[PDB]
Design a protein around this ligand. Structure first.
Ligand SMILES: [Ca+2]
Ligand SMILES: [Ca+2]
Ligand SMILES: [Ca+2]
Ligand SMILES: [Ca+2]
Lengths: 97, 102, 396, 46, 51, 46
């Protein structure tokens, strides 16, 4: 049916049963176009940001986010999330005598 | 995913245990590993860039509470594969790809 | 950055009562908007007694206090029944628009001239994420040289308050996708004109100017004809022509005098696009002073009248007496219908009020058998009665 | 049909089959005016 | 493009392989080089400034 | 006629053929008032 509780442009039934994005709108999933390349998405129909990141379920699912983001994070269940660390390579010591 | 030459850290959303209002969809650990690394599957195999990361061909490592959950839930389940338990919150999995393996 | 600075700067060089009207706008946006849309349809004492007139004209002068220097592109949402589309494009919890509704809308919004009215807030950029989008129809308008825009702040954002004395002309509609919903982006224009909603002094001044010498560039024969037309000629000509005389009843002298007062009108046609007003009772649409249809007080009878006339062709074989002042009079007081005609250029007709000795005050008249395309219909309540404004266009 | 999904003033059919700009409006490509100086542009309609 | 003395770096949009909702028009390397360096074509020859 | 493609308050017909400014409005250039001191401007209508 068509009622949108979290107001993120994916209906509740589609969110709880499975959907995909075609021409930048959500459409009810059908097993026939898994061969055409489409992936099945599922989300929380009571949350806009299911994964907790700054992008809604529709923004992640439809790819309409930063294009440098991995295609992994185009799933509303996987969070777009950077893991940054630092590594030291050598140390210099200036003895001010 | 500790390939040996690299490392890839992921975060997959999991449902809160008690709350009846947490409508996050439940998935197994194997589906989470497939979604988090966009691995392509081949029958029962699960291929990363070129590397198999299916449960038989890796070395999983958990913390104490994750190992407790998974051991607890392997018994009350059938088909005792760790890729069939389903991803509670706070789990910590580390997939080590083996150096030599035939 | 720019709009924030200029807006916060205009909110200082405003007069104290101007800022009063602007801040009491952030409270009665709907109410003062509708009152700006329908203020001019009363008596004069009913006008200067209304407590909203102070803030109304204070806000109007605040707006017109800063006119732009070059054309601007603005964007704002609109409801479909603002353009006589009395169905739904799609309910705002749906995501798609059917080709059928697209074709229906395109069929009904392509060939009219929708007059606008009152104040309205607009934006200078298309809607994005976080903006409120309640209606499927997005109007992209072009505001021309010297149109008052007032930038104000609702404590986080900027709105452009403008006043609408133009008439929008739809060019093309396209179906757009925004955030996974399907809206309609319609490109609009303007076709300017003149109207004298309440300040009828400019009305009679300009009419006096542009038709005074119309009395003395023609033969005095049809002049004496219209002179008899002054005091009881027109009533007999109405008694004759509206019954479709010349096709089934040859009235020799009256048909001759009709031709004589018709060729007395195309000397110099209406010299501009104007928005002339007409007061009419329940007769001009074929009913009676107390018909069951007349009880417009329940809006279902309104809807019935809408389906009856909105989007049709009306013709008047008589000579049409109309007024250039929306202020209501007494001699035809309770006539609950108002044909707000937009008389265009090249319109054969004169200012019948320039002649001294005619009771028609602010009264104009044009050719017989003229056409009138009812572009839209709306209501407004005087006391407890719901009078009916009818916005049409003359295309003869 | 004229519908602009990405909302950038170039319809989908022009954008996926070829267009050009004349007096600042996108027009359907005709192979005639490739020697008047114009160029054939294609891009993504989403 | 490295003409020996100057250097001209370009970026040309290419289509993502697996995505069915990627509509970026597909072109060859010759069309890409011609579009990216404004090179003039006379039959079999593609010309830079005079190179 | 009077259409303004680039919206700079000068019609397209005036920008390509020659115009001048009189009392803060652009008027079509007639060659007779070059002796009053006016000058003939031309521009891009796009
Ligand atoms: Ca939803
Ligand atoms: Ca959701
Ligand atoms: Ca487009
Ligand atoms: Ca211009």
């Amino acid at each position: 049916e068509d009622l949108d509780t979290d107001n993120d442009n994916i209906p509740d039934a589609y969110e709880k049963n499975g959907y995909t994005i075609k021409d930048s709108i959500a459409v009810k999933w059908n097993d026939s176009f898994a061969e055409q390349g489409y992936k099945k998405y599922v989300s929380s129909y009571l949350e806009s940001n299911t994964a907790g990141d700054p992008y809604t379920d529709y923004q992640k699912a439809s790819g309409s986010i930063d294009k440098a983001i991995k295609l992994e994070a185009r799933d509303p269940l996987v969070a777009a999330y950077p893991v940054v660390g630092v590594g030291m390579e050598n140390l210099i010591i200036s003895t001010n005598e | 995913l500790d390939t040996g030459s690299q490392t890839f850290e992921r975060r997959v959303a999991a449902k809160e245990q008690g709350n009846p209002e947490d409508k996050t969809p439940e998935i197994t650990i194997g589906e989470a590993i497939k979604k988090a690394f966009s691995a392509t599957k081949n029958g029962e195999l699960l291929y990363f860039n070129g590397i198999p990361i299916d449960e038989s061909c890796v070395e999983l490592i958990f913390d104490d509470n994750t190992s407790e959950i998974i051991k607890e839930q392997l018994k009350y389940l059938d088909d005792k594969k760790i890729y069939n338990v389903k991803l509670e919150r706070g789990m910590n999995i580390l997939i080590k790809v083996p150096s030599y393996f035939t | 950055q720019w709009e924030k600075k200029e807006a916060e700067r205009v909110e200082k060089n405003l007069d104290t009562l101007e800022k009063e009207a602007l801040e009491l706008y952030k409270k009665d946006s709907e109410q003062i908007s509708n009152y700006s849309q329908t203020r001019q349809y009363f008596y004069d004492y009913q006008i200067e007694s209304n407590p909203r007139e102070k803030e109304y004209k204070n806000l109007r002068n605040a707006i017109s206090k800063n006119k732009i220097d070059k054309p601007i592109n603005v964007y704002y949402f609109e409801s479909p029944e603002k353009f006589a589309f009395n169905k739904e494009i799609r309910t705002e919890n749906q995501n798609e628009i059917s080709l059928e509704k697209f074709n229906e809308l395109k069929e009904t919004i392509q060939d009219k001239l929708f007059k606008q009215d009152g104040f309205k807030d607009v934006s200078l950029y298309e809607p994005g994420n976080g903006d409120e989008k309640p209606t499927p129809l997005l109007i992209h308008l072009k505001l021309p040289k010297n149109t008052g825009m007032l930038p104000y702040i609702n404590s986080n954002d900027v709105k452009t308050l403008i006043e609408q004395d133009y008439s929008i002309k739809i060019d093309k509609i396209v179906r757009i996708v925004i955030e996974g919903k399907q809206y309609i982006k319609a490109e609009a224009s303007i076709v300017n004109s003149l109207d004298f909603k309440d300040d009828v002094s400019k009305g009679d001044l300009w009419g006096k100017e542009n038709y005074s010498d119309w009395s003395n560039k023609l033969t005095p024969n049809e002049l004496a004809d219209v002179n008899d037309y002054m005091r009881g000629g027109y009533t007999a000509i109405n008694n004759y022509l509206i019954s479709n005389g010349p096709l089934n009843n040859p009235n020799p002298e009256l048909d001759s005098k009709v031709n004589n007062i018709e060729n007395a009108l195309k000397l110099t046609p209406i010299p501009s696009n104007l928005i002339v007003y007409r007061r009419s009772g329940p007769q001009e649409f074929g009913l009676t002073l107390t018909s069951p249809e007349y009880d417009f007080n329940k809006i279902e009878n309104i809807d019935a009248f809408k389906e009856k006339w909105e989007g049709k062709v009306i013709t008047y074989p008589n000579f049409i007496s109309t007024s250039i002042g929306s202020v209501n009079m007494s001699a035809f007081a309770k006539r609950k219908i108002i044909l707000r005609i937009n008389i265009p250029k090249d319109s054969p007709g004169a200012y019948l009020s320039a002649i001294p000795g005619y009771a028609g005050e602010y009264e104009v008249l044009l050719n017989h058998g003229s056409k009138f395309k009812i572009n839209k219909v709306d209501s407004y309540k005087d006391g407890t009665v719901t009078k009916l404004i009818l916005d049409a266009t003359l295309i003869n």
